RNA sequence: UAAGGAACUCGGCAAAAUGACCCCGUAACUUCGGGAGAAGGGGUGCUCUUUAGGGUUAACGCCCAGAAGAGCCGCAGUGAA
RNA sequence: AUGGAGAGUUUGAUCCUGGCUCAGGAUGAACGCUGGCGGCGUGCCUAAUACAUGCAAGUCGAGCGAACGGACGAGAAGCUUGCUUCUCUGAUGUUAGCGGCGGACGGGUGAGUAACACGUGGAUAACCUACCUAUAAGACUGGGAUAACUUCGGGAAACCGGAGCUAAUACCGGAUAAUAUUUUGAACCGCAUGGUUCAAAAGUGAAAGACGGUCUUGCUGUCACUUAUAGAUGGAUCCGCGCUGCAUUAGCUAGUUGGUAAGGUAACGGCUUACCAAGGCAACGAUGCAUAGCCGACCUGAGAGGGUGAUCGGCCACACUGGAACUGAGACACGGUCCAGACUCCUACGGGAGGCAGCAGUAGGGAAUCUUCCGCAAUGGGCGAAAGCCUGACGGAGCAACGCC
RNA sequence: CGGUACCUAAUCAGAAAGCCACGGCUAACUACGUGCCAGCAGCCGCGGUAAUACGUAGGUGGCAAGCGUUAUCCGGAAUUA
RNA sequence: UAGGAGCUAGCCGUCGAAGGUGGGACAAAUGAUUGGGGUGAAGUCGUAACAAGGUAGCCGUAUCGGAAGGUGCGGCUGGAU
């Protein structure tokens, strides 16, 4: 049963795993430059007690969470509530 | 709602949460059944020099989130 | 410059690894040769396994000398080593997984067989 | 995987089937939701339902599924469609 | 001196190739001493950084470097002998 | 616990010890005259030899740009007087495909497989769950594209080449109604680690088609769509045993000996790193060698109880070898890319791949495996309302003192 | 898979049986070509002008779809404690 | 210009089955090669030991031996006189 399993693997990974650098590159480049600057208690130090806790129902509704540092990375930020 | 709480004997010393267990128990045979002494150990290193080296203790050494002592500690008991 | 008493490499999978030459056939008194020619030779290093084994008499054909050639184009082809390949009194080789580059001037040589067997041809 | 398994059994033409619905990931020979009775549902007598009739609360409320013949015989037993009455309850 | 590489020759005579220093590695056999430089490998330029010294130390400095990287240039770095 | 002569059991023979063809059974069985019939059970050992593949995994316009044809009306007759050569419907059907799919399993093998690999039993503070059941939201959604559709040459070729372009149940631009989200005081447990207490801020869409009689939507029922919960389900981490046996295999080992800080597993770690002692491992024959899928399985010694894998059942690992990545929730995939590798074929040279471990037989062999066997008939399940296929699963057809009746 | 089974009984005394040997133990009979020759030949044999036995035979023996073996375990033989 | 940081286009180090190199290990043929036993009439040697085996001697034990056999020094009965 030899079929065309090999030809649309790439474009379906371009509808999913390249959407995983369309919506996700905001994290990929952030871990190097942008989030690396928003960290360090900088000018925009830790504004996710209220930012995420308003936006994560609205539009900032990402789904890449796990555990065992304080989260995978970031979800422990409603500390000041 | 319970886990491993056996008894043993400490050996070696360094930082970070002793108890370097050496349990003693029995093992036997088929045709004649000679249940006789044997042992099994779990190494780690000194608590804060609280665990006295050579201490026949109720043993285990707490859940590992770094790398020298194995699993669920109970309480240090008796010196040997 | 190719002469006998000269160490020639192979580029096939017959069982040989290195040879050197006895002869350069052709005519009475013929000394030397270059790409496009047939020689005899004998193997001072054989590949373990394979048909053709060390200390054995063999014919072969030239490829890609460092004394590369110039054509009726008025233009030139050279290499940075030489090599031979071994045959079966038929323009038919023994090893059949030829490596490395080869020239085009052996279609005339009627090793077109070998050229189809070959990688890139020049 | 998962429909009511009418499972092959026996010697030369002794298809003594068994009431089962195999696991959502196991084969006809593999592990299962649960084996519910020892009878051939294609018996020459009848469907002939002898099962763990009290187990209708677990596998029907989690995972199990009949196929087109025994959903009838289960609810003239008071199990399958009757579990819909239980869910309404 | 291309290319080939002892076919020369009675015979590799001759010439060719090697070498300095540093590092790593060096079998057999032994009358135990040795063999053994065994073999076989690898390396060396110039600049900025200390590393921190050998101290040149008075001490970082004075050079070599403790010797550590990072860099610059060329086909080429005991560039000669 | 129920078993039990040895035809005999050495020398000159009397005697002890001794081990002993054999005669009896069964065996994956098999070797040396086919019979009344039938029946069982079974199934490449050598040939895990290469494997040719056929065929080996397929299901949904009940998702839609629907393209195509085309139902139906179907102007005008195109006149040896019967068309959809026309209006719009353009349904249903490959739909052009874009999409929901699985595909490891029904299928195969035990190659490998030192240790939970499995047999086999535990503790788990070591939890997640396309297909799935049930309690809580409706059936808000960007359609760029996108094959729809067009355009540009090449080479027999492999298969590419440039130029643009619509739908979807695709998915996605913007707000949302289900332990959603982890902080202020809120408890103790298995110290570590759990316990949700708080207030949920934080979940947030959509998949609407085919649409029943009608209210064309109630809930859009269907079978496909978004959100907490558990759970079926499976896997899931931590301990004992066979988790290896074996010195004409012994002295074993060096961030080593596996906590603290950074990192990450639904969980958790030297898994790497700044510190820890040379320690740790030891003739418990560690090291290392050999080996390994594991259990029952059978036979059977008086009972003691045991050796038992071919089959046959269960439980691991691998699917042209290998290596990187992708991935489907999980894949290194029996019938996924790039590949080395290897050969295979093709070559018209420009380069392309193939790809037997489904199941038959092909070369082969054997004492042995049927038959490149039958069909999905039934049952089976994956996707699919309906319906479909895979069937080489399934069942069967032949085979037979292999062993009889 | 089944115009086959069930059935008429169509059918007729019909349409369906070999072993080592004829050896003490092998119970299968004594014989001849047989004179330790051929060769059957299992503990062991026989055979040399009186072979039962080599070869052969009508029966012929132990059980019958029957006849003897081959690898495995054990009876045998706790001759494996 | 993403030009800043960036990854592809460019540079500093990684393993990778692979690939081929190298010395050991095992083999197998065996080499105008080559040691132990048995074996097949033992023609080779006396019945060498068993009747003091013709002479009781023996056990460790120099010793040579084609083969039964022999001579040296410490313990011994396993002996007829």
Short mmCIF file of N, CA and C (backbone and C1' of nucleotides) in Angstrom, two decimals, chain H residues 10-71:
data_model
loop_
_atom_site.label_atom_id
_atom_site.label_comp_id
_atom_site.label_asym_id
_atom_site.label_seq_id
_atom_site.Cartn_x
_atom_site.Cartn_y
_atom_site.Cartn_z
P G H 10 27.48 29.90 2.54
"O5'" G H 10 28.12 30.96 3.54
"C5'" G H 10 28.85 32.07 3.04
"C4'" G H 10 29.74 32.72 4.07
"C3'" G H 10 30.47 31.80 5.03
"O3'" G H 10 31.60 31.17 4.47
"C1'" G H 10 29.58 33.64 6.22
P C H 11 32.42 30.09 5.33
"O5'" C H 11 33.32 30.96 6.31
"C5'" C H 11 34.15 30.33 7.28
"C4'" C H 11 34.34 31.18 8.50
"C3'" C H 11 34.55 30.44 9.82
"O3'" C H 11 35.91 30.07 10.04
"C1'" C H 11 32.87 32.08 10.09
P C H 12 36.30 28.81 10.96
"O5'" C H 12 36.57 29.43 12.41
"C5'" C H 12 37.40 28.76 13.35
"C4'" C H 12 36.89 28.91 14.77
"C3'" C H 12 36.42 27.63 15.45
"O3'" C H 12 37.47 26.86 16.04
"C1'" C H 12 34.75 29.25 15.66
P G H 13 37.44 25.26 15.96
"O5'" G H 13 36.15 24.81 16.78
"C5'" G H 13 36.13 24.85 18.21
"C4'" G H 13 35.22 23.80 18.81
"C3'" G H 13 35.74 22.36 18.79
"O3'" G H 13 35.20 21.70 19.95
"C1'" G H 13 33.73 22.46 17.60
P U H 14 35.44 20.14 20.25
"O5'" U H 14 34.02 19.49 19.96
"C5'" U H 14 33.92 18.23 19.32
"C4'" U H 14 32.49 17.75 19.25
"C3'" U H 14 32.27 16.51 18.41
"O3'" U H 14 32.55 15.32 19.12
"C1'" U H 14 30.64 18.14 17.87
P C H 15 33.78 14.36 18.71
"O5'" C H 15 33.12 12.91 18.69
"C5'" C H 15 32.15 12.56 19.66
"C4'" C H 15 30.75 12.62 19.09
"C3'" C H 15 30.37 11.48 18.17
"O3'" C H 15 29.89 10.36 18.90
"C1'" C H 15 29.78 13.57 17.18
P G H 16 30.54 8.90 18.73
"O5'" G H 16 29.68 8.24 17.57
"C5'" G H 16 29.87 8.66 16.24
"C4'" G H 16 28.61 8.57 15.42
"C3'" G H 16 28.83 8.04 14.02
"O3'" G H 16 28.89 6.64 13.95
"C1'" G H 16 27.67 10.06 13.87
P A H 17 30.32 5.92 13.89
"O5'" A H 17 29.97 4.50 13.26
"C5'" A H 17 29.19 3.60 14.02
"C4'" A H 17 27.79 3.46 13.49
"C3'" A H 17 27.63 2.88 12.11
"O3'" A H 17 27.93 1.51 11.99
"C1'" A H 17 26.21 4.71 12.29
P A H 18 29.28 1.05 11.23
"O5'" A H 18 29.39 2.02 9.96
"C5'" A H 18 28.37 2.07 8.98
"C4'" A H 18 28.64 3.11 7.93
"C3'" A H 18 29.91 2.94 7.13
"O3'" A H 18 29.80 1.95 6.13
"C1'" A H 18 29.63 5.22 7.72
P G H 19 30.90 0.79 6.02
"O5'" G H 19 32.18 1.55 5.46
"C5'" G H 19 32.09 2.27 4.24
"C4'" G H 19 33.19 3.28 4.11
"C3'" G H 19 34.58 2.85 4.55
"O3'" G H 19 35.23 2.00 3.63
"C1'" G H 19 34.14 4.93 5.46
P G H 20 35.34 0.41 3.90
"O5'" G H 20 36.89 0.11 3.71
"C5'" G H 20 37.62 0.77 2.69
"C4'" G H 20 38.49 1.87 3.25
"C3'" G H 20 39.69 1.42 4.05
"O3'" G H 20 40.78 1.07 3.21
"C1'" G H 20 38.58 3.23 5.14
P U H 21 41.56 -0.32 3.38
"O5'" U H 21 42.87 0.09 4.17
"C5'" U H 21 42.79 0.35 5.56
"C4'" U H 21 43.89 1.25 6.05
"C3'" U H 21 44.70 0.67 7.20
"O3'" U H 21 45.78 -0.13 6.75
"C1'" U H 21 43.86 2.75 7.85
P G H 22 45.80 -1.71 7.04
"O5'" G H 22 46.65 -1.83 8.38
"C5'" G H 22 47.94 -1.26 8.46
"C4'" G H 22 48.22 -0.71 9.83
"C3'" G H 22 48.12 -1.69 10.98
"O3'" G H 22 49.26 -2.51 11.14
"C1'" G H 22 46.86 0.18 11.52
P G H 23 49.25 -4.05 10.65
"O5'" G H 23 49.61 -4.87 11.97
"C5'" G H 23 50.86 -4.68 12.61
"C4'" G H 23 50.71 -4.70 14.11
"C3'" G H 23 50.05 -5.94 14.69
"O3'" G H 23 50.95 -7.02 14.84
"C1'" G H 23 48.99 -4.04 15.57
P G H 24 50.42 -8.54 14.93
"O5'" G H 24 50.34 -8.82 16.49
"C5'" G H 24 49.71 -9.99 16.99
"C4'" G H 24 48.85 -9.68 18.18
"C3'" G H 24 47.63 -10.56 18.37
"O3'" G H 24 47.92 -11.77 19.06
"C1'" G H 24 46.96 -8.31 18.45
P A H 25 47.88 -13.19 18.31
"O5'" A H 25 46.47 -13.79 18.71
"C5'" A H 25 46.10 -13.95 20.07
"C4'" A H 25 44.62 -13.75 20.25
"C3'" A H 25 43.74 -14.57 19.32
"O3'" A H 25 43.52 -15.89 19.78
"C1'" A H 25 43.07 -12.32 19.22
P C H 26 44.51 -17.09 19.36
"O5'" C H 26 43.56 -18.16 18.68
"C5'" C H 26 42.44 -18.69 19.38
"C4'" C H 26 41.18 -18.56 18.57
"C3'" C H 26 41.24 -19.14 17.17
"O3'" C H 26 41.03 -20.54 17.13
"C1'" C H 26 40.34 -16.97 17.06
P A H 27 42.28 -21.57 17.07
"O5'" A H 27 42.23 -22.20 15.61
"C5'" A H 27 41.14 -23.02 15.20
"C4'" A H 27 40.24 -22.26 14.27
"C3'" A H 27 40.63 -22.27 12.80
"O3'" A H 27 40.08 -23.32 12.03
"C1'" A H 27 40.30 -20.05 13.52
P A H 28 40.05 -24.84 12.54
"O5'" A H 28 39.37 -25.62 11.33
"C5'" A H 28 38.50 -24.96 10.41
"C4'" A H 28 39.20 -24.60 9.13
"C3'" A H 28 40.45 -25.39 8.78
"O3'" A H 28 40.17 -26.64 8.18
"C1'" A H 28 40.89 -23.09 8.50
P A H 29 41.20 -27.87 8.29
"O5'" A H 29 42.00 -27.84 6.92
"C5'" A H 29 41.33 -27.77 5.67
"C4'" A H 29 42.16 -27.03 4.66
"C3'" A H 29 43.60 -27.52 4.50
"O3'" A H 29 43.72 -28.55 3.54
"C1'" A H 29 43.60 -25.20 4.94
P U H 30 43.87 -30.08 3.99
"O5'" U H 30 45.24 -30.12 4.80
"C5'" U H 30 46.49 -30.00 4.14
"C4'" U H 30 47.08 -28.63 4.36
"C3'" U H 30 48.55 -28.59 4.72
"O3'" U H 30 49.39 -28.69 3.58
"C1'" U H 30 47.34 -27.19 6.19
P G H 31 49.93 -30.12 3.07
"O5'" G H 31 51.49 -29.90 2.87
"C5'" G H 31 51.98 -29.03 1.86
"C4'" G H 31 52.51 -27.74 2.45
"C3'" G H 31 53.90 -27.82 3.06
"O3'" G H 31 54.89 -27.57 2.09
"C1'" G H 31 52.40 -26.63 4.49
P A H 32 56.23 -28.45 2.00
"O5'" A H 32 56.20 -28.99 0.51
"C5'" A H 32 55.44 -30.13 0.15
"C4'" A H 32 56.33 -31.32 -0.13
"C3'" A H 32 56.95 -32.00 1.08
"O3'" A H 32 56.07 -32.81 1.84
"C1'" A H 32 58.62 -31.66 -0.52
P U H 33 56.40 -33.17 3.38
"O5'" U H 33 55.91 -31.91 4.23
"C5'" U H 33 55.60 -32.04 5.62
"C4'" U H 33 56.42 -31.12 6.49
"C3'" U H 33 56.89 -31.68 7.82
"O3'" U H 33 58.03 -32.52 7.72
"C1'" U H 33 56.00 -29.52 8.17
P U H 34 58.78 -32.99 9.06
"O5'" U H 34 57.63 -32.97 10.16
"C5'" U H 34 57.92 -33.16 11.54
"C4'" U H 34 56.96 -32.41 12.42
"C3'" U H 34 56.27 -33.22 13.51
"O3'" U H 34 57.08 -33.40 14.66
"C1'" U H 34 54.67 -31.90 12.38
P G H 35 56.88 -34.69 15.61
"O5'" G H 35 56.34 -34.09 16.99
"C5'" G H 35 56.70 -34.70 18.22
"C4'" G H 35 55.64 -34.53 19.27
"C3'" G H 35 55.43 -35.74 20.17
"O3'" G H 35 54.94 -35.31 21.44
"C1'" G H 35 53.46 -35.33 18.98
P G H 36 54.93 -36.32 22.69
"O5'" G H 36 53.62 -37.19 22.48
"C5'" G H 36 53.55 -38.53 22.94
"C4'" G H 36 52.15 -38.90 23.37
"C3'" G H 36 51.71 -40.32 23.07
"O3'" G H 36 52.11 -41.26 24.05
"C1'" G H 36 50.08 -38.83 22.29
P G H 37 52.12 -42.83 23.72
"O5'" G H 37 50.58 -43.20 23.52
"C5'" G H 37 49.72 -43.42 24.63
"C4'" G H 37 48.28 -43.40 24.19
"C3'" G H 37 47.79 -44.62 23.42
"O3'" G H 37 47.36 -45.68 24.26
"C1'" G H 37 47.23 -42.68 22.23
P G H 38 47.90 -47.18 24.06
"O5'" G H 38 46.95 -47.81 22.95
"C5'" G H 38 45.65 -48.27 23.28
"C4'" G H 38 44.64 -47.77 22.28
"C3'" G H 38 44.47 -48.62 21.02
"O3'" G H 38 43.54 -49.67 21.19
"C1'" G H 38 44.80 -46.36 20.42
P U H 39 43.97 -51.22 21.04
"O5'" U H 39 43.51 -51.62 19.57
"C5'" U H 39 42.21 -51.31 19.08
"C4'" U H 39 42.28 -50.73 17.69
"C3'" U H 39 42.97 -51.60 16.65
"O3'" U H 39 42.12 -52.57 16.04
"C1'" U H 39 43.84 -49.39 16.56
P G H 40 41.82 -53.98 16.75
"O5'" G H 40 42.34 -55.08 15.72
"C5'" G H 40 41.61 -55.42 14.54
"C4'" G H 40 42.36 -55.00 13.30
"C3'" G H 40 43.61 -55.79 12.92
"O3'" G H 40 43.35 -57.00 12.22
"C1'" G H 40 44.10 -53.50 12.86
P A H 41 43.29 -58.43 12.97
"O5'" A H 41 44.75 -59.06 12.86
"C5'" A H 41 45.34 -59.71 13.97
"C4'" A H 41 46.24 -60.87 13.59
"C3'" A H 41 47.31 -61.21 14.62
"O3'" A H 41 46.82 -62.00 15.68
"C1'" A H 41 48.29 -61.10 12.48
P A H 42 47.34 -61.72 17.17
"O5'" A H 42 48.93 -61.64 16.99
"C5'" A H 42 49.69 -60.59 17.55
"C4'" A H 42 50.75 -60.12 16.59
"C3'" A H 42 52.18 -60.26 17.06
"O3'" A H 42 52.71 -61.53 16.70
"C1'" A H 42 51.79 -58.02 16.40
P G H 43 54.28 -61.86 16.78
"O5'" G H 43 54.73 -61.92 15.25
"C5'" G H 43 55.08 -63.15 14.63
"C4'" G H 43 56.07 -62.95 13.50
"C3'" G H 43 57.22 -62.00 13.79
"O3'" G H 43 58.31 -62.65 14.40
"C1'" G H 43 56.15 -61.33 11.81
P U H 44 58.55 -62.54 15.99
"O5'" U H 44 59.19 -61.10 16.17
"C5'" U H 44 60.50 -60.82 15.70
"C4'" U H 44 60.99 -59.50 16.23
"C3'" U H 44 60.62 -59.15 17.67
"O3'" U H 44 61.53 -59.65 18.64
"C1'" U H 44 60.00 -57.37 16.26
P C H 45 62.06 -61.17 18.59
"O5'" C H 45 62.75 -61.41 20.01
"C5'" C H 45 63.41 -60.36 20.71
"C4'" C H 45 62.60 -59.93 21.91
"C3'" C H 45 62.14 -61.04 22.83
"O3'" C H 45 63.12 -61.44 23.76
"C1'" C H 45 60.31 -59.66 22.30
P G H 46 63.88 -62.85 23.58
"O5'" G H 46 62.70 -63.92 23.54
"C5'" G H 46 62.66 -65.01 24.45
"C4'" G H 46 62.12 -64.58 25.79
"C3'" G H 46 61.14 -65.53 26.47
"O3'" G H 46 61.71 -66.60 27.20
"C1'" G H 46 60.20 -63.37 26.43
P U H 47 60.84 -67.93 27.46
"O5'" U H 47 59.34 -67.42 27.67
"C5'" U H 47 58.66 -67.49 28.92
"C4'" U H 47 57.94 -66.20 29.20
"C3'" U H 47 56.82 -66.21 30.24
"O3'" U H 47 56.84 -64.97 30.95
"C1'" U H 47 56.01 -65.36 28.22
P A H 48 57.89 -64.73 32.15
"O5'" A H 48 58.59 -63.34 31.80
"C5'" A H 48 60.01 -63.22 31.77
"C4'" A H 48 60.48 -61.80 31.55
"C3'" A H 48 59.78 -60.73 32.39
"O3'" A H 48 60.41 -60.52 33.65
"C1'" A H 48 59.59 -60.15 30.13
P A H 49 59.78 -61.10 35.01
"O5'" A H 49 58.81 -59.93 35.51
"C5'" A H 49 58.42 -59.85 36.88
"C4'" A H 49 56.95 -59.52 37.01
"C3'" A H 49 56.07 -60.66 37.51
"O3'" A H 49 56.01 -60.71 38.92
"C1'" A H 49 55.14 -59.74 35.54
P C H 50 55.72 -62.10 39.68
"O5'" C H 50 54.27 -62.53 39.17
"C5'" C H 50 53.10 -61.97 39.74
"C4'" C H 50 51.87 -62.67 39.23
"C3'" C H 50 51.82 -64.17 39.46
"O3'" C H 50 51.40 -64.54 40.77
"C1'" C H 50 51.25 -63.70 37.21
P A H 51 52.46 -64.88 41.94
"O5'" A H 51 52.54 -66.47 41.98
"C5'" A H 51 53.35 -67.19 41.05
"C4'" A H 51 53.91 -68.48 41.62
"C3'" A H 51 55.35 -68.79 41.20
"O3'" A H 51 55.96 -69.55 42.23
"C1'" A H 51 53.97 -70.52 40.48
P A H 52 56.67 -68.85 43.48
"O5'" A H 52 56.76 -67.31 43.07
"C5'" A H 52 56.57 -66.27 44.03
"C4'" A H 52 57.87 -65.58 44.35
"C3'" A H 52 58.91 -65.59 43.23
"O3'" A H 52 59.58 -64.34 43.18
"C1'" A H 52 59.83 -66.58 45.17
P G H 53 60.50 -63.95 41.92
"O5'" G H 53 60.05 -64.95 40.76
"C5'" G H 53 59.02 -64.61 39.83
"C4'" G H 53 59.23 -65.32 38.52
"C3'" G H 53 59.20 -64.47 37.26
"O3'" G H 53 60.24 -64.89 36.38
"C1'" G H 53 57.58 -66.20 37.11
P G H 54 61.73 -64.32 36.56
"O5'" G H 54 62.54 -65.54 37.19
"C5'" G H 54 62.79 -65.62 38.59
"C4'" G H 54 62.72 -67.05 39.08
"C3'" G H 54 63.85 -67.95 38.59
"O3'" G H 54 64.09 -68.98 39.54
"C1'" G H 54 61.81 -68.76 37.77
P U H 55 65.53 -69.11 40.25
"O5'" U H 55 65.73 -67.69 40.94
"C5'" U H 55 66.62 -67.54 42.03
"C4'" U H 55 66.65 -66.12 42.53
"C3'" U H 55 65.32 -65.59 43.05
"O3'" U H 55 65.55 -64.69 44.13
"C1'" U H 55 66.00 -64.29 41.20
P A H 56 65.23 -65.14 45.63
"O5'" A H 56 63.70 -64.73 45.82
"C5'" A H 56 63.27 -63.43 45.48
"C4'" A H 56 61.77 -63.30 45.50
"C3'" A H 56 61.25 -61.90 45.22
"O3'" A H 56 61.17 -61.59 43.84
"C1'" A H 56 60.29 -62.66 47.21
P G H 57 62.41 -60.95 43.02
"O5'" G H 57 63.48 -60.57 44.15
"C5'" G H 57 63.62 -59.22 44.60
"C4'" G H 57 62.35 -58.69 45.23
"C3'" G H 57 62.10 -57.21 45.11
"O3'" G H 57 61.72 -56.81 43.80
"C1'" G H 57 61.57 -57.91 47.28
P C H 58 62.06 -55.33 43.27
"O5'" C H 58 60.88 -54.44 43.87
"C5'" C H 58 59.53 -54.83 43.68
"C4'" C H 58 58.63 -54.21 44.71
"C3'" C H 58 58.52 -52.69 44.68
"O3'" C H 58 57.65 -52.22 43.67
"C1'" C H 58 58.82 -53.41 46.90
P C H 59 57.85 -50.75 43.05
"O5'" C H 59 57.49 -49.76 44.25
"C5'" C H 59 56.15 -49.46 44.59
"C4'" C H 59 56.07 -48.41 45.68
"C3'" C H 59 56.71 -47.06 45.36
"O3'" C H 59 55.88 -46.20 44.59
"C1'" C H 59 57.50 -47.79 47.43
P G H 60 56.52 -45.06 43.65
"O5'" G H 60 56.72 -43.80 44.61
"C5'" G H 60 56.92 -42.50 44.06
"C4'" G H 60 57.91 -41.70 44.87
"C3'" G H 60 59.13 -41.18 44.13
"O3'" G H 60 58.87 -39.96 43.47
"C1'" G H 60 59.77 -42.17 46.18
P U H 61 59.47 -39.66 42.01
"O5'" U H 61 60.91 -40.33 42.03
"C5'" U H 61 62.02 -39.65 42.60
"C4'" U H 61 63.29 -40.46 42.47
"C3'" U H 61 63.56 -41.04 41.09
"O3'" U H 61 64.23 -40.11 40.25
"C1'" U H 61 63.85 -42.72 42.75
P A H 62 64.67 -40.52 38.76
"O5'" A H 62 66.26 -40.41 38.77
"C5'" A H 62 66.90 -39.14 38.79
"C4'" A H 62 68.37 -39.27 38.51
"C3'" A H 62 68.73 -39.87 37.16
"O3'" A H 62 68.68 -38.93 36.10
"C1'" A H 62 69.96 -40.97 38.83
P U H 63 67.81 -39.27 34.80
"O5'" U H 63 68.36 -40.69 34.34
"C5'" U H 63 69.71 -40.85 33.96
"C4'" U H 63 70.04 -42.31 33.73
"C3'" U H 63 69.10 -43.04 32.80
"O3'" U H 63 69.42 -42.84 31.43
"C1'" U H 63 69.36 -44.30 34.76
P C H 64 68.82 -41.57 30.64
"O5'" C H 64 68.77 -42.08 29.14
"C5'" C H 64 69.95 -42.55 28.51
"C4'" C H 64 69.89 -44.04 28.28
"C3'" C H 64 68.76 -44.54 27.40
"O3'" C H 64 68.96 -44.32 26.01
"C1'" C H 64 68.93 -45.92 29.29
P G H 65 67.70 -43.98 25.07
"O5'" G H 65 66.85 -45.33 25.04
"C5'" G H 65 67.27 -46.44 24.27
"C4'" G H 65 66.55 -47.70 24.67
"C3'" G H 65 65.07 -47.77 24.29
"O3'" G H 65 64.86 -48.19 22.95
"C1'" G H 65 65.32 -48.34 26.56
P G H 66 64.24 -47.19 21.85
"O5'" G H 66 62.67 -47.47 21.91
"C5'" G H 66 61.80 -46.97 20.91
"C4'" G H 66 60.94 -48.05 20.31
"C3'" G H 66 60.99 -49.43 20.97
"O3'" G H 66 60.10 -49.56 22.06
"C1'" G H 66 61.28 -49.65 18.63
P A H 67 60.21 -48.60 23.34
"O5'" A H 67 59.17 -49.20 24.38
"C5'" A H 67 57.87 -49.59 23.97
"C4'" A H 67 57.70 -51.09 24.05
"C3'" A H 67 58.39 -51.79 25.21
"O3'" A H 67 57.65 -51.72 26.42
"C1'" A H 67 58.86 -52.94 23.21
P A H 68 58.37 -51.40 27.81
"O5'" A H 68 58.79 -52.83 28.37
"C5'" A H 68 58.00 -53.52 29.33
"C4'" A H 68 57.55 -54.86 28.80
"C3'" A H 68 58.17 -56.09 29.45
"O3'" A H 68 57.59 -56.43 30.69
"C1'" A H 68 58.16 -56.33 27.09
P G H 69 58.34 -56.12 32.08
"O5'" G H 69 59.87 -56.48 31.81
"C5'" G H 69 60.85 -56.28 32.81
"C4'" G H 69 62.23 -56.16 32.21
"C3'" G H 69 63.28 -55.48 33.09
"O3'" G H 69 63.86 -56.35 34.04
"C1'" G H 69 63.32 -54.50 30.95
P G H 70 63.93 -55.93 35.60
"O5'" G H 70 65.17 -54.92 35.67
"C5'" G H 70 66.48 -55.38 35.97
"C4'" G H 70 67.53 -54.59 35.23
"C3'" G H 70 68.18 -53.45 36.01
"O3'" G H 70 69.26 -53.88 36.82
"C1'" G H 70 67.51 -52.68 33.86
P U H 71 69.10 -54.06 38.42
"O5'" U H 71 70.05 -52.94 39.04
"C5'" U H 71 71.45 -53.14 39.17
"C4'" U H 71 72.22 -51.88 38.85
"C3'" U H 71 71.98 -50.69 39.78
"O3'" U H 71 72.82 -50.73 40.92
"C1'" U H 71 71.79 -50.01 37.51
#
